[PDB]
Design a protein around this ligand. Structure first.
Ligand code: CL7
Ligand code: CL7
Ligand code: CL7
Ligand code: CL7
Ligand code: CL7
Ligand code: CL7
Ligand code: CL7
Ligand SMILES: CCCCCCCCCCCCCCCC(=O)OC[C@H](CO[C@@H]1O[C@H](CS(=O)(=O)O)[C@@H](O)[C@H](O)[C@H]1O)OC(=O)CCCCCCCCCCCCCCC
Ligand SMILES: CC1=C(/C=C/C(C)=C/C=C/C(C)=C/C=C/C=C(C)/C=C/C=C(C)/C=C/C2=C[C@H](C)[C@H](O)CC2(C)C)C(C)(C)C[C@@H](O)C1
Ligand SMILES: CC1=C(/C=C/C(C)=C/C=C/C(C)=C/C=C/C=C(C)/C=C/C=C(C)/C=C/C2=C[C@H](C)[C@H](O)CC2(C)C)C(C)(C)C[C@@H](O)C1
Ligand SMILES: CC1=C(/C=C/C(C)=C/C=C/C(C)=C/C=C/C=C(C)/C=C/C=C(C)/C=C/C2=C[C@H](C)[C@H](O)CC2(C)C)C(C)(C)C[C@@H](O)C1
Lengths: 63, 68, 344, 349, 331
């Protein structure tokens, strides 16, 4: 892996590793935060986080 | 309602804080920044893939495979 | 131990040693056991290496740590850095094993028949040796005696080098070395003046002169601490608990270990190449390590590599333990880490 | 015994030999029986080896522990370590068997003669032999007598080497040996100064002088212990119980076993090559071994190999048993080990 | 905690909780300095590990070695790196500084008293009591920090002039260059009045080491004098008090000259952003201080990086904290 800008060239494989390392870490932090932090009333009511259907909607869009 | 061992291990993660939220906006402002950040990141990548942006010494094509 | 406020602390088996922190007899016993195990390792692996030794291959490319160090102090190497005989190695190992047995006997005694608390012993010669974690006056004399032993060992090494002689890589054989000693020189080394970088000593005469100076320093300090109480300001500065002294000792050990690891990595007069191998290069990545100037393929790794790399991490984690025990002695509770998240 | 706190402990049959720790007559009987077993081993094994002896095969190649030991101490060995006459070995084994029968008869005699305790027996002179696990005066006298016997044995060895001769691999034939006497050289072997290493003794003269010294020391110590009660500090240091004395003896025996094990593998004089085989070399992997230093192909192992390894293990486990018995006699009960994975402290006296 | 915007007690804003806690704040700054000093030494050691002798520095992608080589460290005639050990020494010494700073930060966060207002009444530590309202207290802080910065600048200049000098771009090697001390000539650069005519990039068109070294001497002397000024007086003057400021605290210009924690922070942040932009211009144009023998010729990327940082600090941070401080002046 190399963090120099040419790792963003999609045809150079050195990006992929550089991605999955850094992004991997980004998810771990992103995991830890969500494993601890609570939502916000505003967002919680807006997105209806108590209802699994919202998870379905967002996941389908992501996929 | 079987009281299994694994259920004892995992019930705290399942629904200890079920239905709890902090009032107001909380961390939502900070989230905003993150979104904008990635909105640049992805955008940049797209243009780099699109050859709109040409980074120095970064030839976005099959020639960049040189070195393997 | 810290035991923030609470008394009658329950320690799980995984943290078991803390239980005996408040008994002096068991404390002594445990430390006799520790030094016994160190001595046992020394002797046992002298024998182990001798058992896996070929007088044909290069010494350093064979995985060895005790034979090269014994050779560096004479004892089996004549010239050109080749081990001729092996029996003095066996004799040294046997003496180390016997000393280990004696020390372990002392430890086992302290556990069973020795007094759990020295002050409560009837002998009243044992009540002399009792100590308390808050009394710097007694710990001063303990420190003084231990410094005396350290300085005596350093002086003994000096005299053995002078009279019997140690390896001289510049000379290429075992030589009796006269001490080239001058205070101005040693302050030049201390200030790292351009001709004098203390990690690049070139003449063992300077090494042994430094050892004479260091032995004098240790003996002077030992007598000083046996005779002179700590000053009142020390009570203001330092903390008074066992964990605090553990933190100070861990800091000192980390400092010593970093110096030793770097010394092994870069010097080649104290560590002759024919014994320990070529010099190493420091290399930083996500974590530091020392790498071989010569190729490590076909030769595994040299003795110098193992010694310096091991002691770097010994020193690093000793530093981490120093921080841990310092914070513990500061009353900081680590139960705050899995508690803060709960509050958030 | 120990009986932590609670007396009148009940022992299973697996640990059933601790039942007679307080019955002096039965104690005597057990130990006479054990000594009978030892001497019976010596004689019977001598005959068992003689049965399959091959003059063609070198002595150490075949599996022996007794023919080399006899051939070393004179007893029908020709020049160049040749077993000329195989009758003296038969005579030695036979005398050992007769002695074993005598000892076993005495053992059964005491196991059935009178009371279990030697205090009650109305012999009025066997009561001179009843001992205690607390009194150090009687045990000092006992120690003195046994040391007398050991010194008398060393003296007998000195005399037999002086008159009958003894094998000398350096000479190459059985030869009388002058008993040396040089306290200076004895102490120089004590220090292991570079000239003299105790495990590399080269001249049987030095061995004979050391044996003369040992005999003198043992006899003097025996006299001293018979006459003189132990000093008070020896009551301060040592506990007074049977298991404690067993622990002391076990530690001593473990040390002696390790010393003899190292002696076998290295010294060539007192363990001649033609009888026991070429010297071994000490290896240390997980546990110490003695490598044969010879191709075991079509030759098995030399007798020196077997002796050295067996006695290394005997010494090591005698040390472990010494630790066990000393730990008990000092007061430590091992049941507390079961409390290891709990929060209760794994510790007592 | 001395603020009531809407979200004072939020964990993601928790640093504001140390607004008045002097001891904890001192510890936090010390730990931060530990970070700032760990990075250079660590990355210098990492760089020296992979340094190759034949290839030149601009083609190796080193971002700390060029600045060290610019000072004559481990280089000889012709501007080629000869010995790499002094870079390693610099890295190690930064490790030492970082360790000392981290030790101090740990002490003041946990062992030391949280609030110096709770110090034991002239115990060598009440002398360090400061308050975000009284001017006199903070004046001596500014004075002493100016002392340290001035001594650093003077040391740099003195080294350049007398001891071992610097790598002079024109003379092609390391030399003790004779300083230029024509004060009008030096201060002309601040308006672009370079000798070769007015130039767009102020202070950045210096074409000789003598100008820069003379400027450093001038700056050191000026900062030493200002340090004396602030340490020895500590009293507000009609420059700070009674100056025009425009703020919705009172709609329109006012001569109040208000003082507040967020305001001090905002002025400092704006200053840092401004230094960032000035350094952007410097590395863009001034190649006397950045010999392209080391930093390469094309240097638009580094200048742009500096520009972005300077804008973030000067505009973003400065505005945010200034507005918060002015609003908090409604107490
Ligand atoms: C790694 C950083 C570190 C260093 C180097 C360090 N400590 Mg600690 N350290 C101590 C001494 C110490 C000394 C003398 C010392 C100097 O060398 C150090 N430390 C140094 C003790 C006073 C104190 C408690 C020490 C204590 O009880 O340590 C025991 C800990 C461990 C992991 C043993 C597990 C190791 C083996 C792999 C597993 C063995 C299993 C076994 C084979 C099976 C059963 C066999 C049986 C049936 C026969 C201590 C602590 C503790 C910690 C932590 C986190 C540390 N440390 C850390 C360090 C406690 O929780 C802990 C603490 O205080 O929490 C309350
Ligand atoms: C040689 C076996 C052994 C070792 C290695 C050993 N002790 Mg002892 N030892 C002491 C210190 C000591 C230190 C500081 C120390 C570290 O080197 C040791 N020991 C080590 C004193 C606290 C204490 C007082 C005797 C004393 O130190 O004088 C002591 C004893 C004692 C004994 C005994 C038998 C021992 N030991 C034995 C040992 C007391 O009766 C005796 C005892 O405990 O009587 C109650
Ligand atoms: C293997 C280590 C070891 C050695 C070498 C050793 N013992 Mg023991 N040993 C005894 C004698 C003995 C003698 C005379 C002797 C040397 O000649 C030894 N041992 C030596 C008996 C007094 C006693 C029972 C004999 C018995 O169980 O038969 C004994 C024990 C016992 C054990 C154990 C574990 C041992 N041992 C162990 C040893 C009882 O539990 C067990 C025990 O004490 O249970 C309460
Ligand atoms: C010769 C066969 C034999 C042996 C092996 C033997 N005893 Mg006797 N033997 C004793 C010790 C002894 C020891 C310490 C010992 C081992 O060293 C032996 N024995 C061994 C004394 C306790 C005791 C006193 C005689 C005595 O002289 O002591 C004794 C006896 C006695 C006899 C007889 C006939 C024996 N034995 C016989 C033996 C008593 O009646 C006679 C006796 O009193 O029977 C109750
Ligand atoms: C997330 C926002 C955040 C950042 C990035 C941040 N701080 Mg703080 N910060 C400090 C330094 C600091 C430094 C030097 C620093 C960067 O250089 C930062 N901070 C940065 C200390 C001087 C000071 C005392 C810190 C203090 O007391 O720390 C001890 C207590 C805890 C729990 C240790 C923290 C450990 C984390 C939970 C680890 C979790 C990771 C996960 C397992 C994987 C401080 C505070 C504090 C808080 C809070 C809420 C924060 N912060 C928050 C932050 C105090 O209340 C608190 C405070 O002052 O309350 C009055
Ligand atoms: C507008 C006319 C002028 C005045 C009033 C002026 N400068 Mg400049 N001036 C500086 C300080 C300064 C101070 C302390 C100061 C006093 O108030 C001034 N200036 C004032 C430096 C920080 C800075 C050097 C970089 C500077 C420059 C620069 C210029 C230019 C052209 C000027 N100036 C010009 C002026 C840079 O190249 C250049 C520039 O583009 O930055 C704005
Ligand atoms: C000797 C030249 C000097 C230098 C080196 C200098 N100042 Mg001043 N300077 C300040 C900060 C400062 C910083 C942070 C700083 C370096 O970064 C400097 N200064 C530097 C402010 C605290 C303070 C208010 C500036 C203000 O806003 O008016 C200040 C002043 C003031 C003066 C004077 C005369 C100075 N100075 C002088 C200097 C106020 O009257 C005047 C003063 O004392 O008002 C009470
Ligand atoms: C204990 C109870 C009694 C055991 C009796 C058999 C001993 C076996 C032995 O010595 O093996 C000798 C060998 C070494 O081989 C040996 O190794 C020798 C070289 S060295 O010593 O290993 O370097 C080599 O010379 C020799 O020929 C070879 O056999 O030792 C082992 O393999 C020991 C393995 C032990 C593993 C842990 C066991 C833990 C539970 C117990
Ligand atoms: C200020 C402070 C403190 C202090 C904190 C610290 C960090 C204390 C640290 C003390 C240290 C690190 C002392 C280190 C001393 C190093 C010495 C004395 C080096 C000695 C080397 C000698 C004497 C000779 C060595 C050779 C001898 C050797 C044989 C070779 O021939 C080479 C040759 C000639 C270099 C406290 C703890 C008191 C209070 C804190 O709160 C703050
Ligand atoms: C110190 C102490 C204790 C320990 C006490 C102990 C266990 C002390 C240990 C004592 C030992 C190990 C004594 C060993 C003595 C060894 C002797 C006397 C060796 C004699 C060997 C001789 C004479 C050899 C003779 C030849 C034999 C042989 C032929 C050689 O080729 C040559 C020649 C002729 C020299 C405690 C633990 C019990 C109590 C503590 O509080 C105090
Ligand atoms: C107080 C005030 C305010 C603020 C006003 C502002 C923004 C004031 C700005 C103040 C500044 C920017 C002061 C900075 C002055 C910079 C100086 C004095 C720099 C000197 C540098 C020198 C002399 C170095 C010179 C060299 C030295 C250097 C080493 C190089 O070799 C180049 C070379 C040789 C030119 C408001 C906004 C609140 C209200 C206003 O009305 C008044």
């Amino acid at each position: 892996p190399d963090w120099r800008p040419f790792a963003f060239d999609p045809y150079n494989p050195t990006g992929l590793v550089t991605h999955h390392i850094s992004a991997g870490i980004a998810l771990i932090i992103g995991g830890i935060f969500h494993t601890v932090s609570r939502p916000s009333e505003r967002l919680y009511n807006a997105l209806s986080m108590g209802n699994v259907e919202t998870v379905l909607s967002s996941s389908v869009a992501f996929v | 309602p079987k009281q299994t061992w694994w259920g004892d291990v995992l019930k705290g993660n399942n629904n200890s804080e079920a239905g709890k939220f902090v009032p107001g906006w909380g961390t939502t402002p900070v989230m905003a920044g993150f979104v904008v950040m990635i909105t640049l990141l992805l955008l940049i990548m797209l243009q780099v893939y699109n050859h709109t942006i040409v980074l120095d010494g970064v030839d976005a094509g099959w020639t960049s495979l040189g070195g393997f | 131990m810290q035991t923030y406020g609470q008394t009658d602390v329950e320690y799980g088996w995984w943290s078991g040693n803390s239980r005996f922190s408040d008994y002096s007899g068991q404390f002594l016993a445990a430390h006799n056991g520790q030094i016994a195990s160190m001595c046992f390792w020394a002797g046992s692996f002298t024998l182990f290496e001798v058992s896996r030794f070929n007088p044909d291959l290069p010494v350093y490319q064979q995985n060895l740590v005790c034979i090269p160090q014994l050779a560096r102090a004479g004892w089996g190497v004549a010239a050109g850095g080749a081990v001729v005989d092996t029996y003095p190695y066996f004799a040294i190992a046997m003496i180390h094993l016997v000393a280990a047995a004696i020390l372990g006997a002392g430890a086992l005694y302290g556990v069973t028949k020795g007094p759990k608390v020295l002050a409560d012993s009837e002998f009243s010669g044992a009540q002399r040796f009792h100590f308390e974690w808050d009394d710097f006056e007694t710990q001063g004399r303990i420190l003084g005696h231990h410094l005396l032993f350290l300085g005596a060992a350093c002086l003994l090494f000096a005299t053995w080098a002078c009279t019997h002689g140690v390896y001289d890589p510049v000379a290429g054989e075992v030589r009796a070395i006269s001490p080239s000693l001058n205070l101005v020189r040693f302050f030049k080394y201390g200030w790292a003046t351009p001709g004098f970088n203390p990690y690049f000593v070139n003449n063992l005469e300077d090494v042994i002169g430094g050892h004479f100076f260091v032995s004098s320093l240790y003996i002077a300090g030992g007598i000083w601490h046996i005779l002179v109480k700590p000053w009142p300001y020390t009570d203001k500065i330092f903390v008074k608990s066992g964990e605090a002294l553990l933190a100070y000792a861990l800091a000192g050990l980390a400092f010593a270990g970093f110096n030793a690891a770097y010394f092994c990595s870069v010097n080649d007069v104290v560590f002759p190449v024919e014994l320990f191998g070529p010099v190493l290069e420091a290399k930083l990545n996500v974590t530091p390590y020392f790498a071989e100037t010569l190729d490590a393929s076909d030769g595994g790794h040299t003795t110098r590599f193992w010694i310096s790399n091991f002691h770097y991490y010994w020193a690093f984690y000793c530093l981490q333990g120093h921080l841990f025990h310092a914070l513990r002695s500061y009353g900081f509770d680590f139960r705050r880490i899995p508690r803060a998240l709960a509050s958030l | 015994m120990q009986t932590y706190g609670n007396q009148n402990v009940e022992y299973g049959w697996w640990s059933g030999n601790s039942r007679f720790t307080d019955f002096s007559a039965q104690f005597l009987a057990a130990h006479i029986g054990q000594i009978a077993s030892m001497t019976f081993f010596a004689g019977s094994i001598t005959l068992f080896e003689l049965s399959r002896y091959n003059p063609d095969i070198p002595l150490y190649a075949q599996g022996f522990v007794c023919l080399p030991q006899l051939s070393r101490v004179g007893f029908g060995v020709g020049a160049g370590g040749a077993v000329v006459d195989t009758y003296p070995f038969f005579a030695v084994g036979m005398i050992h068997l007769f002695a074993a029968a005598v000892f076993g008869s005495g053992a059964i005699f005491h196991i059935l003669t009178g009371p279990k305790v030697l205090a009650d027996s109305d012999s009025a002179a066997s009561q001179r032999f009843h001992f205690e696990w607390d009194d150090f005066e009687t045990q000092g006298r006992i120690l003195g007598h046994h040391l007398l016997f050991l010194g008398s044995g060393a003296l007998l060895f000195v005399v037999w080497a002086a008159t009958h001769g003894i094998y000398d691999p350096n000479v190459g034939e059985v030869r009388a040996v002058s008993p040396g006497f040089d306290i200076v050289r004895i102490f120089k072997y004590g220090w292991a100064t570079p000239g003299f290493n105790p495990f590399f003794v080269d001249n049987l003269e030095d061995v004979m002088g050391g044996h003369l010294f040992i005999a003198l020391i043992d006899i003097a110590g025996g006299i001293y212990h018979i006459l003189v009660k132990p000093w008070p500090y020896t009551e301060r240091i040592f506990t007074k119980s049977g298991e404690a004395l067993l622990g002391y003896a076990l530690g001593g025996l473990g040390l002696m076993g390790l010393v003899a094990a190292y002696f076998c593998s290295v010294n060539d004089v007192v363990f001649p090559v033609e009888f026991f085989g070429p010297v071994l070399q000490p290896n240390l992997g997980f546990l110490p071994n003695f490598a044969d230093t010879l191709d075991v192909s079509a030759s098995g192992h030399t007798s020196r190999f077997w002796i050295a390894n067996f006695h290394y293990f005997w010494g090591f486990y005698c040390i472990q048993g010494h630790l066990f018995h000393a730990l008990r006699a000092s007061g430590f009960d091992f049941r507390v080990l079961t409390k290891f994975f709990t929060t209760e402290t794994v510790e007592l006296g | 905690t001395s603020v009531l915007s809407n979200f004072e007690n939020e964990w993601w804003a928790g640093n504001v909780r140390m607004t008045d806690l002097s001891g904890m704040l001192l510890g936090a700054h010390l730990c931060h300095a530990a970070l700032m000093s760990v990075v250079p030494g660590a990355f210098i050691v990492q760089e020296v590990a992979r340094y190759q002798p034949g290839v030149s520095l601009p083609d190796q992608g080193m971002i700390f070695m060029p600045h060290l080589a610019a000072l004559g460290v481990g280089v000889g005639a012709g501007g080629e790196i000869v010995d790499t050990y002094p870079f390693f020494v610099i890295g190690v010494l930064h490790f030492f500084i970082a360790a000392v700073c981290c030790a101090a930060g740990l002490f003041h966060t946990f062992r030391g008293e949280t609030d110096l207002n709770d110090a034991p009444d002239d115990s060598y530590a009440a002398a360090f009591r400061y308050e975000w309202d009284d001017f006199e207290s903070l004046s001596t802080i500014v004075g002493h920090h100016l002392v340290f910065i001035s001594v650093a600048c003077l040391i740099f200049a003195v080294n350049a002039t007398y001891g071992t000098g610097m790598y002079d771009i024109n003379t092609d090697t390391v030399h003790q260059i004779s300083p230029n001390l024509n004060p009008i000539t030096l201060i002309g650069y601040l308006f672009g009045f370079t000798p070769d005519g007015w130039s767009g990039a102020g202070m950045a068109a210096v074409n000789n080491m003598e100008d820069v070294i003379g400027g450093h001497f001038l700056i050191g002397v000026i900062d030493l004098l200002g340090a004396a000024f602030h340490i020895l007086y500590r009293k507000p003057t009609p420059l700070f008090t009674k100056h025009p400021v425009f703020s919705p605290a009172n709609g329109g210009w006012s001569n109040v000259g208000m003082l507040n924690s967020e305001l001090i922070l905002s002025w400092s942040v704006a200053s840092v952003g401004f230094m960032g932009i000035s350094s952007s211009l410097f590395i863009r144009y001034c190649d006397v201080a950045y010999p392209p023998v080391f930093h390469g010729v094309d240097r638009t990327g580094a200048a742009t990086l500096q520009l972005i940082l300077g804008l973030v600090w000067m505009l973003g941070g400065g505005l945010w904290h200034g507005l918060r401080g002015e609003r908090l002046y409604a107490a």
